[PDB]
Design a protein around this nucleic acid. Sequence first.
DNA 1: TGCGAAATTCCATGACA
DNA 2: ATTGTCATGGAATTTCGCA
DNA 3: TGCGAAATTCCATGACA
DNA 4: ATTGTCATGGAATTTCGCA
Lengths: 368, 368, 184, 184
Amino acid sequence: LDAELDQLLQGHYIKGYPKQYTYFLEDGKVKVSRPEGVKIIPPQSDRQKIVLQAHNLAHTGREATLLKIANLYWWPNMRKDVVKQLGRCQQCLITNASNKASGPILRPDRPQKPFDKFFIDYIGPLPPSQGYLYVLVVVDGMTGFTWLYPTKAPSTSATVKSLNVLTSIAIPKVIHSDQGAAFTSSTFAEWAKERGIHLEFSTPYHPQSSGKVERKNSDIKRLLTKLLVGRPTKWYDLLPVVQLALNNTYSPVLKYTPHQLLFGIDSNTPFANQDTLDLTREEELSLLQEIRTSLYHPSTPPASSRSWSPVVGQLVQERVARPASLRPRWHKPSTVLKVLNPRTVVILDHLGNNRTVSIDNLKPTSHQ
Amino acid sequence: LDAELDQLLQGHYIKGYPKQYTYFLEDGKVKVSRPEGVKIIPPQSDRQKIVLQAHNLAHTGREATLLKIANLYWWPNMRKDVVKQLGRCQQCLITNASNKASGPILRPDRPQKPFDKFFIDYIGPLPPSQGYLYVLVVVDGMTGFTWLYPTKAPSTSATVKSLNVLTSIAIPKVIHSDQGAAFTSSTFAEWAKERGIHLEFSTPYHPQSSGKVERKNSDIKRLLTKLLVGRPTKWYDLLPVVQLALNNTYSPVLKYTPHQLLFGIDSNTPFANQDTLDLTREEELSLLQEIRTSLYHPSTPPASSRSWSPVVGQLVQERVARPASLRPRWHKPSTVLKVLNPRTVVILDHLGNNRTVSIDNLKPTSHQ
Amino acid sequence: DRPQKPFDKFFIDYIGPLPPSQGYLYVLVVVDGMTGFTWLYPTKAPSTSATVKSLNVLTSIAIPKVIHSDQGAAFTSSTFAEWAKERGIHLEFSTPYHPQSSGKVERKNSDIKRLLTKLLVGRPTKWYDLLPVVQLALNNTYSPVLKYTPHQLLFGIDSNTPFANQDTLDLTREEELSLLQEIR
Amino acid sequence: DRPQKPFDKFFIDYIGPLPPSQGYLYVLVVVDGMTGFTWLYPTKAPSTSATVKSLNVLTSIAIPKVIHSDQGAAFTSSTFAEWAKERGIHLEFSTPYHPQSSGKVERKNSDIKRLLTKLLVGRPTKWYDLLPVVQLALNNTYSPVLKYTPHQLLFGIDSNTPFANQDTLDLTREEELSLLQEIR
DNA sequence: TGCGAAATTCCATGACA
DNA sequence: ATTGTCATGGAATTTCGCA
DNA sequence: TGCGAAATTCCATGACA
DNA sequence: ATTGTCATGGAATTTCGCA
Ligand SMILES: O=C1c2c(ccc(O)c2O)CN1Cc1cccc(Cl)c1F
Ligand SMILES: O=C1c2c(ccc(O)c2O)CN1Cc1cccc(Cl)c1F
Ligand SMILES: [Mg+2]
Ligand SMILES: [Mg+2]
Ligand SMILES: [Mg+2]
Ligand SMILES: [Mg+2]
Ligand SMILES: [Mg+2]
Ligand SMILES: [Mg+2]
Ligand SMILES: [N+]
Ligand SMILES: [N+]
Ligand SMILES: [Zn+2]
Ligand SMILES: [Zn+2]
């Protein structure tokens, strides 16, 4: 108010208003002659309303708001008040984009053994082939060995059917999947408890987390496409072929095929490797154990020059999953309860629940 | 054939087969004792068939194919024959991904004057508001000044309606648009010739080329979203508001609003800048001409470490636009007729036509 | 006193009734005081409501500090005053029976009536479609008192449509003949 | 001569007819010669066609160099020979009336019949659903001659389902009682 | 103990929709 | 309560064949 | 002729679907 | 016959106020 501004019009020094400028009166308003021209100094009790009117014109950020205000006013530390408003504009906070990138991705260790961890997923809908529309893909984490099953839907019932056939071979310690309807059902839960299999889920809307199997999907679609060039897309009869072809393909970085990492010896397929012809099986299995433990493993890449990593108690916002036309892309702010690892957090969510989410589906809330 | 392989079994030196290895016979086949073990040396007349069978197992690239062959054979310069096959596999060439990035983007000069160049586009479908579903967006290249019109469809007829109203203000030299149905129609062509307006089109499927207006779309959707927070999405009545709000918003890098770049003086809007209060109009227009010519202009960023730039006569492939499920993502190879600029080419296309396409919708054909 | 600027003052007025054209009967006429730039809007009536609808289009491009009008009904209504106040536009009326503008504006307004008259003869029904071409004409017309057209003073640049054949704007023998026939 | 390996030789054979279960009547039995690993496939008939359908599933996981069988119709058909030739699998027949395998295989095949018999009593109709659990049992069963189970020899690792209670595999008093009743 | 060429390894690119 | 992946083909680097 | 703080400029991020 | 763009908010840098 006029408290400070009275005390100024005479010529006493108030902290923040630099002494070397002349602060007069005119038209009933305190003014000042600043290099850029003459500007009104409003009373402190007017300042928030001003910053707010300027910000609301087009819901602009720090500079674009300041330049509007600067047109008519000066006062000390304008941007501090501007930023105060930006931090409280519900509408800006939930609609604006982030400009900080996620921290560098983790490269989890490879499962130590075949059957320690299965990654599973559906591809589809594909063009109908014999009344089939999807493929269940099951990928052993350690070996890359992959099983394919054609289904009529990405349903729990068809998942259970196919895995009953698969697990006739071995039972896996863990099965990791995303949060598809087929995997999160209680039926599937029961099906797994019945066998002492642990169900592991990806954070929601984050397929990188099923990267092992997602990546194998690419190879499956790619080979299927090539085999189908200038033919009708009858893929059902090619699943078996694509399966065997891929399980027996070399990985240039590893120098092994998934079949070899699984069995330690080629079967009767074309170009079968014969290097262990003179070893006993037991010597062979010895060599396999060795090969398994020394496979190349990548490491987290450098962080980008403007990433953020979550701190306990920080205000962060979850990305809205399927945002309606003309609706905000972000949820209201929420707090980081726990930091599970540098790329995964638990938050106290938009209702009042605990949610485990990927850092890729969060931004840090701006202006604190 | 056995020509060279006879001449070898005795012990004479053939170019390519190193002398220090022992080349025997066994089971009716030429063999050799290589550090990795004993491998068959097939006759030259068998080699292509072998490379082909190995490649076809899963349509693998250079190394993953070589490792299959190496399992049973050795001969001199295996990879040369492998690469020869990869270059002829129709199926691999049109299905595989590229691994070379485009050259660095161009930053075309800003139009010199208001009305030299309009960039136009449709946003929508939006939620229906008064029976309206789209917005025609028209953006002046030089100033950023934007006009908005609500329409019932992205049609030629509604484009013509809106531009008749707009061009009551001025007629533009050029109107740049993408290849939407509404802009490529002969009716629209005629509508423009009637006024001595030149129609300029983006390369197909390359919205970056309309970047000026695409980018303005973002701001329009963003402000509309904020103004609609917890209200029904009744956007029709907000067009006028969003228009005026955006035309009068500062660009932090430029330090001017589009309205100022257009008129050189603010109108009676909030926070109107008053710096030229004492200038005559003519002095003002003098200052505007100055401000216009000295605006910040960005420059092409550094090339990525693995980009390609098109050379006349090169084999390149156009990306299929809307590729069906399980169908290739690339067209057959074609030849670069002319290099319009480093990011734009004319090619002799997949039928037999000339096409002007963006380097972003091409890969260079692999293995020459 | 500070020099005159664009957006300082808009002068508005109705012209009509005219023969119907695509359903319309009137032209709201807006002329910028400083530049002489003209905007024209077709309306169905000289009402506050039609005025507001039209000025809402214009004022989403630029807002005048002052609107000047005569004491037409549409302009003196308290709805129209509420509108103007909402946008911080001051209203300004010439005293009844005594219209006063500025010479520039007077002259501009004159040209507008003449150029209309000229094109409604022969096609008295097809003017709605012609309003665009009329405005470009008026705004690329050279002003004797200033060295410059309104386009030039508004935008500070030459125009891609110069109207180099400063027109007749005058009724020929065949037009006086079928205008004294149509209005008889 | 080189040491024996997995995939060197698969021994195949039919078991049935059995009481219908989900429409099925037979079990195709595949046993790896080196490891003693067992795969079981349920079929509707001992036909070439059912054999091919089933072996197509298995051979999309691993392909044997040799298939050994008796002179069953399904295995001596020229369709079955065409199939095998297409996949580079050599066929091998024991002379009629004189079945010969290997002791390991003989013993494995024995366990298979016994363990089946044991579970079809009480639920002679519910075996289709049980084939998974049976295979895991057979493949995690310890072999006296080798230090190792077939799971271990196939994959070179311990199994998440060890079958630590080496079973009875023997018919109790209440089972001999309702098996000599059901088959009477 | 060094050269030219081949073989191997490196790694940015892009797609799992 | 969880976490990216890896075929690909030019280019960079190392190894091979010979002296 | 140099300090501490404020003001300005820089610029990677991401969305135009 | 053509071609990316620019609001955003932390951080890096420069300028201001004072001595
Ligand atoms: O595969 C799926 C998938 C998706 C949504 C829901 C599901 O249930 C899925 O399985 C998206 N998606 C493709 C995809 C897009 C981008 C990055 C990666 Cl890594 C990727 F895999
Ligand atoms: O706006 C359009 C648009 C599209 C397809 C056909 C049209 O006619 C369009 O107008 C896609 N698109 C969004 C978009 C995606 C990615 C980059 C940029 Cl720059 C971008 F603008
Ligand atoms: Mg999924
Ligand atoms: Mg997936
Ligand atoms: Mg478009
Ligand atoms: Mg667009
Ligand atoms: Mg009047
Ligand atoms: Mg038999
Ligand atoms: N890990
Ligand atoms: N340019
Ligand atoms: Zn806001
Ligand atoms: Zn191929």
